[PDB]
Amino acid sequence: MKILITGANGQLGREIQKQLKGKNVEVIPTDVQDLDITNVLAVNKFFNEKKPNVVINCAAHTAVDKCEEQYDLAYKINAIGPKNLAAAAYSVGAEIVQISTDYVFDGEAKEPITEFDEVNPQSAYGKTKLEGENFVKALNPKYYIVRTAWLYGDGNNFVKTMINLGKTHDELKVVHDQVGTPTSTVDLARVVLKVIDEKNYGTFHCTCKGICSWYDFAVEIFRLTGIDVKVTPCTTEEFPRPAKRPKYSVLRNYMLELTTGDITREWKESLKEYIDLLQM
Amino acid sequence: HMKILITGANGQLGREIQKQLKGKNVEVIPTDVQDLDITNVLAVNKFFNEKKPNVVINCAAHTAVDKCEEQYDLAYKINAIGPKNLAAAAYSVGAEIVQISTDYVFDGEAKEPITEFDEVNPQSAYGKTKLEGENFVKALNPKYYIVRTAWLYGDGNNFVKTMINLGKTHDELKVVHDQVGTPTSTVDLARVVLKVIDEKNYGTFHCTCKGICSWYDFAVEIFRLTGIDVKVTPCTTEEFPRPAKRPKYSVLRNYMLELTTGDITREWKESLKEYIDLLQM
Amino acid sequence: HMKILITGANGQLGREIQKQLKGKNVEVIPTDVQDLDITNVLAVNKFFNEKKPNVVINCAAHTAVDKCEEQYDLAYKINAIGPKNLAAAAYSVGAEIVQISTDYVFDGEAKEPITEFDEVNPQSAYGKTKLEGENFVKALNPKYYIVRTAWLYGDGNNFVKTMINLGKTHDELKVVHDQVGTPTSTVDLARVVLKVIDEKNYGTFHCTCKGICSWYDFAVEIFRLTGIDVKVTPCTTEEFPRPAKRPKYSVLRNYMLELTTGDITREWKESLKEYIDLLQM
Numbered sequence: 001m002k003i004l005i006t007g008a009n010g011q012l013g014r015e016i017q018k019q020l021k022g023k024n025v026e027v028i029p030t031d032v033q034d035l036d037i038t039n040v041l042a043v044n045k046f047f048n049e050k051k052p053n054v055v056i057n058c059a060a061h062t063a064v065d066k067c068e069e070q071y072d073l074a075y076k077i078n079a080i081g082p083k084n085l086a087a088a089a090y091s092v093g094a095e096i097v098q099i100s101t102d103y104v105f106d107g108e109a110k111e112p113i114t115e116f117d118e119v120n121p122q123s124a125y126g127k128t129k130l131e132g133e134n135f136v137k138a139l140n141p142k143y144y145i146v147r148t149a150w151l152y153g154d155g156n157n158f159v160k161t162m163i164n165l166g167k168t169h170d171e172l173k174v175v176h177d178q179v180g181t182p183t184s185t186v187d188l189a190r191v192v193l194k195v196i197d198e199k200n201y202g203t204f205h206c207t208c209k210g211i212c213s214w215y216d217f218a219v220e221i222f223r224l225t226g227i228d229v230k231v232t233p234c235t236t237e238e239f240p241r242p243a244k245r246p247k248y249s250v251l252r253n254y255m256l257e258l259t260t261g262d263i264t265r266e267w268k269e270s271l272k273e274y275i276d277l278l279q280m
Numbered sequence: 281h282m283k284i285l286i287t288g289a290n291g292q293l294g295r296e297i298q299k300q301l302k303g304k305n306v307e308v309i310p311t312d313v314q315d316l317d318i319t320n321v322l323a324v325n326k327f328f329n330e331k332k333p334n335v336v337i338n339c340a341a342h343t344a345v346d347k348c349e350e351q352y353d354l355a356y357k358i359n360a361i362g363p364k365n366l367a368a369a370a371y372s373v374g375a376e377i378v379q380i381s382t383d384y385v386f387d388g389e390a391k392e393p394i395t396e397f398d399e400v401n402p403q404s405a406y407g408k409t410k411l412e413g414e415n416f417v418k419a420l421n422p423k424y425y426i427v428r429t430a431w432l433y434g435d436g437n438n439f440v441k442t443m444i445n446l447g448k449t450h451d452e453l454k455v456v457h458d459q460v461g462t463p464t465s466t467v468d469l470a471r472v473v474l475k476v477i478d479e480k481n482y483g484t485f486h487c488t489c490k491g492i493c494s495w496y497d498f499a500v501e502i503f504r505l506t507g508i509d510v511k512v513t514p515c516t517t518e519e520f521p522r523p524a525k526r527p528k529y530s531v532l533r534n535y536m537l538e539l540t541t542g543d544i545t546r547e548w549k550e551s552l553k554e555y556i557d558l559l560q561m
Numbered sequence: 562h563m564k565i566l567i568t569g570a571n572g573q574l575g576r577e578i579q580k581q582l583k584g585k586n587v588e589v590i591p592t593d594v595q596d597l598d599i600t601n602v603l604a605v606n607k608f609f610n611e612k613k614p615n616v617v618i619n620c621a622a623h624t625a626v627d628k629c630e631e632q633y634d635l636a637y638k639i640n641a642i643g644p645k646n647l648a649a650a651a652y653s654v655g656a657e658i659v660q661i662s663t664d665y666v667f668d669g670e671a672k673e674p675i676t677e678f679d680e681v682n683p684q685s686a687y688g689k690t691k692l693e694g695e696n697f698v699k700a701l702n703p704k705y706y707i708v709r710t711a712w713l714y715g716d717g718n719n720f721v722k723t724m725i726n727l728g729k730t731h732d733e734l735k736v737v738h739d740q741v742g743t744p745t746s747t748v749d750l751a752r753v754v755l756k757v758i759d760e761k762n763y764g765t766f767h768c769t770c771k772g773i774c775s776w777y778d779f780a781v782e783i784f785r786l787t788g789i790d791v792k793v794t795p796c797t798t799e800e801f802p803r804p805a806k807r808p809k810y811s812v813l814r815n816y817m818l819e820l821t822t823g824d825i826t827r828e829w830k831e832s833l834k835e836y837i838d839l840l841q842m
């Protein structure tokens with residue numbers, strides 16, 4: 001089995017490579033310098049020559065505020081990229097996994113969101129990622145769309161940010177009026193490889209179990225590291241940004257629950273495992 | 281030569297399809313839950329990979345409408361995940377899929393016969409879960425047929441048998457007159473399913489019998505045809521409330537059939553008479 | 562060699578595609594209704610199974626916009642069922658499908674150039690039936706190209722020829738100035754169609770010429786180019802009412818071209834001048 005990973009140097013790309021080490025698979029990791037997924041001719045040629053069995057697309061323009069000003073570039077990476085990969089995959093009979101986002105929803109939900117709830121993106125990042133999902137489904141029947149959120153792993157992320165700020169500050173203000181679930185790439189990668197394995201095609205939410213605010217997330221980070229910093233809960237209005245962020249983006253892993261099982265862990269368990277890895 | 285898997289094959293429609301395929305040049309593989317549980321992805325994949333059917337017709341459903349409201353997870357598993365599993369597994373072996381669906385995808389606020397190009401707006405768990413099943417089938421397999429039906433009777437429990445049993449044990453009955461649709465025989469539905477497969481006339485089709493009436497009118501005609509002496513009284517929906525919202529108006533126009541190879545269904549009274557005659561053998 | 566079936570091949574675009582494919586290394590099979598009626602499923606299936614094209618380009622449509630309002634069944638057959646039939650028949654033989662569509666899928670209430678990611682909301686029979694055609698094509702064949710165009714002129718009847726004739730027989734004309742879009746030559750549309758096929762750049766594309774004007778501005782430029790002495794007066798839509806709702810604002814941005822392999826269309830006045838020059842040979 002030949003697996004192409006795009007955006008392979010990112011957080012999730014790295015964790016998938018790691019979980020696939022020693023398995024009976026040939027992994028082809030690419031990032032932008034090896035394969036620019038926005039270029040249709042390049043993508044078609046690559047797939048026709050390499051003939052992967054699966055493509056996992058971890059490439060994205062994830063700077064959320066920058067997407068508002070770089071709408072064209074967001075569409076190219078977040079939407080056209082997936083379109084190109086899905087079709088090129090189809091031409092060689094390959095499956096596609098497309099990683100997506102909780103920003104497809106408007107944030108006005110009051111309870112955990114399922115895969116059957118209606119999308120309504122209020123941001124360029126959300127809109128462009130959604131159009132990426134729509135292309136993937138339209139162009140390749142052998143699709144998996146895996147939506148995630150608040151993702152941390154081998155790369156820049158909120159955990160590393162908090163740690164670095166916390167070491168240089170005596171107090172921090174962190175939003176308490178935005179809720180979701182911190183997710184480790186370890187859990188997301190396990191799920192990605194699980195549905196591939198089962199051929200459990202479709203759209204899946206995949207965040208860790210539980211719920212909290214960014215404030216709660218920060219407090220647990222500092223509890224776990226021992227860093228002495230006073231965190232103060234604040235509101236979204238106090239520190240405004242170019243992109244609209246959802247008040248409530250808790251995803252229910254419903255499709256996993258209804259099929260072969262929600263194997264993700266409680267968010268604090270995954271986070272402890274990650275902090276341990278870092279302090280090593 | 282042609283190999284046809286039927287899921288939910290012991291149900292009303294499943295039985296009628298088996299019957300209409302007897303003696304045809306096809307290998308039929310009837311399954312119900314104890315042979316193939318369609319909610320189980322691994323079991324479904326393995327079954328398709330080994331049997332390699334050319335067509336799957338999915339007649340399995342969680343049709344207890346009121347019970348779906350209290351069993352939402354189970355309704356999703358049977359009414360949506362099942363179809364998903366069958367559509368993908370079919371796609372993996374190059375098979376076509378027929379997915380039977382429902383008028384409950386609509387909100388019941390229509391004022392004239394509803395076409396396949398009208399907008400869906402399910403107000404029930406049953407309708408919502410059946411709709412998501414349609415969505416999956418189309419997303420996962422380009423060789424699809426979605427056939428929506430309603431008020432279905434045949435070889436199984438149904439309104440006709442219920443009315444007959446009540447009517448024999450009661451001097452009068454109240455039946456809703458403010459809900460309208462069209463009584464449909466599995467005979468007509470099954471002829472249509474097999475017709476579109478035969479033509480490779482892919483897409484979404486409405487398939488109810490011709491004409492229009494209320495459940496009250498349906499009951500009155502049942503008792504006229506059986507000779508059962510029972511006074512039926514028309515009533516309203518508010519008088520006898522249920523857990524699931526039921527459409528006021530769920531008349532489906534068989535527009536895609538009309539626009540393509542012909543609406544071969546019969547007027548509802550004709551199909552019903554043929555059914556009652558079969559019963560009183 | 563590559564085999565390209567063209568349906569509606571005698572129409573404006575069908576003729577231009579044939580012309581741009583002359584001398585290329587492709588076998589072109591032009592058909593119009595008398596050779597292949599696309600609304601007939603059995604005929605369409607048989608044709609594809611025998612000819613096995615690699616690509617179908619569908620240029621056939623019921624484009625009489627006002628007449629669609631009174632011929633809704635026929636519009637559905639040609640504008641939706643035809644594409645459905647072609648998309649599925651193509652799929653069965655591994656063929657790609659290009660489906661030509663319309664700015665009438667939008668409601669006309671936009672205030673800036675409309676992209677392929679904007680929401681559809683047809684207010685006419687023509688628009689609604691063409692939209693359903695799009696939906697079928699994408700559902701039934703993953704190797705699809707939907708190319709939306711507007712205000713199209715070429716080798717057939719069109720606004721350019723109409724204006725020229727009226728202008729020769731009239732001293733003044735009233736032309737609507739409150740409906741805006743962009744005049745589009747089949748030369749540019751055909752180049753785009755053949756470009757995306759060549760690239761395997763699947764998806765939905767807008768393809769009108771660059772720029773923006775009203776029908777009034779279009780007329781004024783036509784008469785400037787031909788030298789015809791006629792006074793054109795700008796008017797409103799309310800002054801001269803028609804059965805079909807027309808969009809106030811139907812400027813399509815060719816955004817998918819811009820974001821992918823390039824918007825090769827020309828400025829509308831350049832395309833139009835080339836066309837008028839061809840006409841006055």
Ligand SMILES: NC(=O)C1=CN([C@@H]2O[C@H](COP(=O)(O)OP(=O)(O)OC[C@H]3O[C@@H](n4cnc5c(N)ncnc54)[C@H](O)[C@@H]3O)[C@@H](O)[C@H]2O)C=CC1
Pocket residue numbers: 006007008009010011012013030031032035036037038057058059060061062077099100101102129148149150151152155156
């Ligand atoms: N980061 C988060 O909190 C969330 C992430 N996601 C999604 O999860 C997935 C993984 O995110 P991370 O691993 O954190 O992303 P990351 O930002 O750590 O890495 C993304 C990779 O994509 C690459 N890329 C950019 N343009 C490319 C192109 N033209 N061709 C090929 N590669 C290109 C980047 O160079 C980078 O290596 C993405 O699809 C993202 O949208 C969704 C919701 C939240």
Ligand SMILES: NC(=O)C1=CN([C@@H]2O[C@H](COP(=O)(O)OP(=O)(O)OC[C@H]3O[C@@H](n4cnc5c(N)ncnc54)[C@H](O)[C@@H]3O)[C@@H](O)[C@H]2O)C=CC1
Pocket residue numbers: 287288289290291292293294311312313316317318319338339340341342343358380381382383410429430431432433436
């Ligand atoms: N009966 C009616 O008035 C209406 C029926 N329909 C649709 O018509 C279709 C056929 O209806 P009927 O033949 O009357 O249904 P039925 O209730 O007579 O039979 C359905 C079958 O589903 C089977 N089933 C349940 N779970 C299963 C599983 N996990 N795996 C395999 N089989 C399973 C049952 O065992 C049963 O044999 C269904 O899709 C239903 O949604 C739609 C609207 C109304």
Ligand SMILES: NC(=O)C1=CN([C@@H]2O[C@H](COP(=O)(O)OP(=O)(O)OC[C@H]3O[C@@H](n4cnc5c(N)ncnc54)[C@H](O)[C@@H]3O)[C@@H](O)[C@H]2O)C=CC1
Pocket residue numbers: 568569570571572573574575592593594597598599600619620621622623624639643661662663664665691710711712713714717718
């Ligand atoms: N005319 C315009 O301003 C615009 C055109 N379009 C679209 O552009 C495309 C091309 O339009 P034109 O080239 O102007 O069309 P045209 O009207 O010049 O030619 C259309 C063709 O449809 C054929 N046709 C009708 N029924 C058929 C059937 N059953 N089977 C096979 N062929 C059949 C006709 O005989 C004719 O050759 C169409 O898809 C149309 O909807 C969209 C927006 C605007």
